[PDB]
Amino acid sequence: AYSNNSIAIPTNFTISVTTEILPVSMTKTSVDCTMYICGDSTECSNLLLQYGSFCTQLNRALTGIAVEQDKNTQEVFAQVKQIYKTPQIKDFGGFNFSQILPDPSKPSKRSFIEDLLFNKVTLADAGFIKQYGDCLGDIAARDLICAQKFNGLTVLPPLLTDEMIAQYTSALLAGTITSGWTFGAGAALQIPFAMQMAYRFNGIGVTQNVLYENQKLIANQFNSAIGKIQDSLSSTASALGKLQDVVNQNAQALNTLVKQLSSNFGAISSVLNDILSRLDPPEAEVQIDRLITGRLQSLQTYVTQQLIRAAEIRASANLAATKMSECVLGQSKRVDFCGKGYHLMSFPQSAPHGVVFLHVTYVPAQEKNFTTAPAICHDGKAHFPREGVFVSNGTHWFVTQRNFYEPQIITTDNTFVSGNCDVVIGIVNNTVYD
Amino acid sequence: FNGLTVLPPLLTDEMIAQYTSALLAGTITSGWTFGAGAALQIPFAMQMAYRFNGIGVTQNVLYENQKLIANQFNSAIGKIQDSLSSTASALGKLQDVVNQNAQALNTLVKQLSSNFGAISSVLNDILSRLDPPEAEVQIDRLITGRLQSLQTYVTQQLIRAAEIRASANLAATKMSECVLGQSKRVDFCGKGYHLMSFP
Amino acid sequence: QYGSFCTQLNRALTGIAVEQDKNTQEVFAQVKQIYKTPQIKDFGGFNFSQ
Amino acid sequence: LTESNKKFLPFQQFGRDIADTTDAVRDPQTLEILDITPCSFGGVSVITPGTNASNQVAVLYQDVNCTEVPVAIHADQLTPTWRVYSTGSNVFQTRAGCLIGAEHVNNSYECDIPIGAGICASYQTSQSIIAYTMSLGAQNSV
Ligand SMILES: *[C@@H]1O[C@H](CO)[C@@H](O)[C@H](O)[C@H]1NC(C)=O
Ligand SMILES: *[C@@H]1O[C@H](CO)[C@@H](O)[C@H](O)[C@H]1NC(C)=O
Ligand SMILES: *[C@@H]1O[C@H](CO)[C@@H](O)[C@H](O)[C@H]1NC(C)=O
Ligand SMILES: *[C@@H]1O[C@H](CO)[C@@H](O)[C@H](O)[C@H]1NC(C)=O
Ligand SMILES: *[C@@H]1O[C@H](CO)[C@@H](O)[C@H](O)[C@H]1NC(C)=O
Ligand SMILES: *[C@@H]1O[C@H](CO)[C@@H](O)[C@H](O)[C@H]1NC(C)=O
Ligand SMILES: *[C@@H]1O[C@H](CO)[C@@H](O)[C@H](O)[C@H]1NC(C)=O
Ligand SMILES: *[C@@H]1O[C@H](CO)[C@@H](O)[C@H](O)[C@H]1NC(C)=O
Ligand SMILES: *[C@@H]1O[C@H](CO)[C@@H](O)[C@H](O)[C@H]1NC(C)=O
Ligand SMILES: *[C@@H]1O[C@H](CO)[C@@H](O)[C@H](O)[C@H]1NC(C)=O
Ligand SMILES: *[C@@H]1O[C@H](CO)[C@@H](O)[C@H](O)[C@H]1NC(C)=O
């Protein structure tokens, strides 16, 4: 409902907490050059020796990918090298952080929401276990992991354990709740939490008296938002599609690489054993060469897709690092970067091969239309407000701030004089008491 | 006829135009308020005064010189329209993307005539002249070549898709920051002191 | 007799198409409320007809 | 070749694996099922300082507990000066396999050579290879 003399000013507000999930790293893998192609065969290894440095390049690329995965994790989570511990007190002016602060009861010092997130990913760490005792004498055939292990494909463990990542996140949380943004620019400087919230309110353009007068309501809204986030996490399971997608893609790539070993590639048989069993060597070289070419093309395809996926994950990790540095270590004025609305704060939470951000924002709730004028005329002078807008309650004229309806009587401190009343368009007549 | 097809986009151009029209109406009738929540009405001159305060110039400068600024804006829009209607090389990027994709597809089609070391590139006149166990060698050579061509095409497509994804992410950030608000980043929403953007 | 060579190509092309649609949606679907152009054009001398 | 618990069909002779590999074979003379395992163990990493520094190395065996390290790597039919790295004295067990050839210390330093699962190796003073838990940083409080 657009008009040239009508404005709408919000009266209430809502404190909303949103979730953002960003993949940070993927699984690191290694491939045996000889045991995948010519597994346990001196003749085939001798033939493979005539292909030069084909697989050294593959090993180099995979090593670079693993190194960059560790680097991505370090850049995302190691912003601060000082490990602040959670204070013994919880007097944060009515704010309840028990759902995100670490819980010493668990064997891994993780919070409730972190436990939910780590239990929401159905991966079971298939690369782990299988400690060369599981692939031993048993009635059943080999699993999908023993097949990879016996054909030269391995998974390297990450440098940082989940407990160390949890410690980093806990230090970040303690710093951001006990010092504000000061711990990112240097030494951590203590400040009561309500004062920090007032500073953020001033940052978003709302005077801190709004926070001070309505502290209890804001604290209750924050607690309810955290509870709703926890309930949503504990109910649904499709919010973590990205991390599960990365894990599934990597596992599918490895499984396809294993299952490609049964292709004939134009030879008499895909089994290397029953070529040297039936064919004399100089006749067997042709079949062995065809098999070598096919199995060497498979590895190149796998490595190329791995490099592309690594580039995508590196971009995601860079975005996550920027988000941490800007939303968590400070207050961001970029729109739609740290949550929809006016950004207040963010809280980091660790996830399997990823990070989770709890953005806290300020949203106006109920608007009310009013009549507004660009300027107020007086005895040969025009008046404009220093900070705020002019609003009339049908009979009187007041000045009020932008994002919260708080009318004030027009005095000399509110408005400044510039020019005369004829130049300005829409300037209305009203009295300005001193 | 050789198995290569083009899938239509999910969103038609009319739906995209509707989205852009909604964005324009919101940004001209409410300011930046419609991005952070409910759209709140405000007269346009007051919104321009708010932007002037954002760039560090007192709003009385806008109020006193409203007509001149409006005329300058109209003249700038007219000059932009004339420049668009005169030249044609300003849209090199989109035409470049279209040409690259079309050239890739055309090269993939034209690669079907390569012999790849076989007697003939035509599959029909190998099974016509050679008995099957002897024809298997030629068929295998042709299969290997035509399977390598597809892999090269797919790898190039993946790299181009990554580049386009980066460009789309930049476009989304530009929309959110320049259109849904006022940006203080230098040289991000135009050279100078940013006021507004229109998609 | 060449195994799953082309299933991977199909998977990659499908992912590319899906991400193209996702790119368009992320760029253009920021707001889900379709505001219509006002009947008035009294924008204080500014001309948006073009 | 080892003894197998797998059951073959009465007329079967070979057993095939998922990746078209021979798993178990029935002995023609004594009708028993023997499973076939490759004698090449994948997952051996060599931790070394530069060749200009020294020649000492520490070997890491992935996903193996050091009780069955000599069995896994077939240390019986191996040359000397490799059987030293199979059954040693500086045996340390980590979550990323277990490391042989490096002395374990309880002092936490900054990471020098990342091994995995929070364990890093370094070459320090005479000189020897030490392995330790990496340090995230200096403890602090507000
Ligand atoms: C614009 O404001 C003038 C007064 O300055 C008023 O007469 C006119 O009706 C307004 N325009 C509309 C469309 O209401
Ligand atoms: C704002 O909303 C809360 C929650 O409904 C309510 O308790 C409070 O009275 C409202 N404030 C105003 C000024 O309407
Ligand atoms: C914080 O919430 C938990 C459960 O949500 C509750 O047990 C605890 O008492 C709350 N904190 C305070 C100070 O009431
Ligand atoms: C304020 O008034 C305008 C015009 O009279 C109307 O279109 C608009 O809906 C009103 N606002 C509310 C919140 O009712
Ligand atoms: C607008 O608010 C003022 C402030 O109390 C009041 O005196 C005045 O009567 C109100 N106007 C109307 C029309 O209610
Ligand atoms: C305010 O002053 C102007 C000239 O200074 C005059 O035209 C107008 O009528 C006055 N308004 C009222 C309500 O007296
Ligand atoms: C806006 O420009 C068009 C052509 O550029 C013109 O026809 C129209 O009259 C202009 N608007 C006004 C209000 O004059
Ligand atoms: C084969 O002959 C050997 C030697 O006499 C004997 O030990 C073995 O039991 C025989 N196996 C069968 C299946 O007859
Ligand atoms: C190894 O490199 C260092 C580094 O300069 C050098 O001082 C040393 O002489 C080198 N060792 C040999 C044996 O050359
Ligand atoms: C195998 O490794 C585990 C480590 O989880 C260890 O507890 C166990 O004792 C080892 N096996 C033997 C036979 O010692
Ligand atoms: C290091 O800690 C282990 C485990 O407590 C202990 O057995 C060992 O003696 C310690 N080393 C030294 C030098 O004290």
Author numbering:
A (entry chain B): 698 to 1131
B (entry chain C): 847 to 1045
C (entry chain C): 747 to 796
D (entry chain A): 548 to 672, 681 to 697
Study authors write:
In this study, we systematically investigated BANAL-52 and BANAL-103, which exhibit the closest genetic proximity to SARS-CoV-2, focusing on their spike structures and functional characteristics. The cell entry of coronavirus into host cells is a critical determinant of their infectivity and cross-species transmission, which is mainly mediated by the conformational change of the spike protein involving receptor recognition and membrane fusion. Second, Cryo-EM structural analyses revealed that BANAL-52 S is stabilized in a “locked” state through linoleic acid (LA) binding and an additional N370 glycan, whereas BANAL-103 S adopts a “closed” conformation due to a unique glycan network. In contrast, both exhibit more compact S1 conformation compared to the SARS-CoV-2 S in activated conformation and ACE2-bound conformation. These suggest that BANAL S proteins are likely to be in an inactivated conformation under physiological conditions, which accounts for their lower receptor binding compared to SARS-CoV-2.
Cryo-EM data were collected for both BANAL-52 and BANAL-103 S ectodomains, yielding density maps at a resolution of 3.51 Å for BANAL-52 S and 3.11 Å for BANAL-103 S. For BANAL-103 S, the final model includes all residues from 15 to 1131 (excluding residues 72–74, 145–151, 246–252, and 673–680) along with glycans N-linked to 20 sites. Similarly, BANAL-103 S aligns well with the previously reported BANAL-52 closed-conformation S, with an RMSD of 0.88 Å. In contrast, for BANAL-103 S, no LA density was detected in the cryo-EM map. However, it possesses two additional N-glycosylation sites (N112 and N366) located in the NTD and RBD, respectively. These sites, along with N161 and N230, form a more compact trapezoid glycan pocket that restricts the RBD conformational changes. Correlating these findings with their receptor-binding capabilities, we speculate that the extra N-glycosylation sites forming a compact glycan pocket maintain BANAL-103 S in a closed conformation, whereas BANAL-52 S is stabilized in a locked conformation due to the additional binding of LA to the RBD, resulting in even lower S-receptor binding. Compared to BANAL-52 and other SARS-CoV-2-related coronavirus spikes, the BANAL-103 spike contains two extra N-glycans linked to its RBD conformational change, which stabilize the spike in a closed conformation. The results indicated that SARS-CoV-2 and BANAL-103 S-NTD proteins can weakly bind to bovine mucin, while BANAL-52 exhibited no apparent binding. These findings suggest that BANAL-103 S, with glycan binding capacity, would be more easily activated compared to BANAL-52 S, consistent with the biochemical assay results.
